[PDB]
Amino acid sequence: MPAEYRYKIVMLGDGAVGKTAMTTRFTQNFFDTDYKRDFAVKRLQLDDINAHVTLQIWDLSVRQGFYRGARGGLLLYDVTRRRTFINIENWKEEAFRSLQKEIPLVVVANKVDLKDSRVVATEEGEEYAKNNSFMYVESSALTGENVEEAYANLCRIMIEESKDISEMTST
Numbered sequence: 001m002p003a004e005y006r007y008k009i010v011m012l013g014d015g016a017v018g019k020t021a022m023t024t025r026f027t028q029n030f031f032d033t034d035y036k037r038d039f040a041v042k043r044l045q046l047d048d049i050n051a052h053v054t055l056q057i058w059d060l061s062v063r064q065g066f067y068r069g070a071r072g073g074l075l076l077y078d079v080t081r082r083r084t085f086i087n088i089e090n091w092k093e094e095a096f097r098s099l100q101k102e103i104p105l106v107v108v109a110n111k112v113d114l115k116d117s118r119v120v121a122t123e124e125g126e127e128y129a130k131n132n133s134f135m136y137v138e139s140s141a142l143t144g145e146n147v148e149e150a151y152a153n154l155c156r157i158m159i160e161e162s163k164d165i166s167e168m169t170s171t
């Protein structure tokens with residue numbers, strides 16, 4: 001039998017960066033320009049470590065309830081709009097201030113299928129993530145590229161932090 005984990009996570013980023021589309025791709029495995037949209041649920045098996053994760057995936061007084069109890073998040077920007085890349089630091093700070101602690105974040109450069117209108121280079125997002133010891137993923141909700149991987153990476157990080165805490169409480 002697999003180990004069982006449960007986490008609330010938050011989708012962060014400016015409007016129209018693809019938070020809903022990424023969540024829809026992850027939980028329903030499709031994409032629709034005309035998808036009409038507080039949380040979605042995903043049950044995910046991680047074979048490598050025989051672990052089963054149940055995720056509550058939250059997506060935008062209200063902000064404090066939005067963040068409360070989150071153990072991780074995806075920090076999205078739209079690679080075709082530099083202003084959304086500039087603002088990921090503001091989202092990180094808002095989340096950390098609301099929670100009064102750091103939580104693991106995976107930096108997600110979304111919409112990479114839009115090659116001809118991309119303005120934020122891969123190396124810029126890698127550098128921001130590296131400065132914060134965040135992982136970095138290039139994703140497309142449209143094609144599905146690396147969408148599951150982004151959530152899976154975050155899941156594994158939260159599981160390792162759960163294990164860390166188990167050890168700290170067991171000295």
Ligand SMILES: Nc1nc2c(ncn2[C@@H]2O[C@H](COP(=O)(O)OP(=O)(O)O)[C@@H](O)[C@H]2O)c(=O)[nH]1
Nearest residue numbers: 015016017018019020021033110111140141142
């Ligand atoms: N080409 C492309 N379009 C995307 C992608 N992700 C989202 N979109 C589109 O970008 C727009 C904004 O996405 P949405 O999910 O509403 O962003 P949200 O406001 O952050 O939840 C919608 O028209 C989506 O269909 C993507 O990965 N590639």
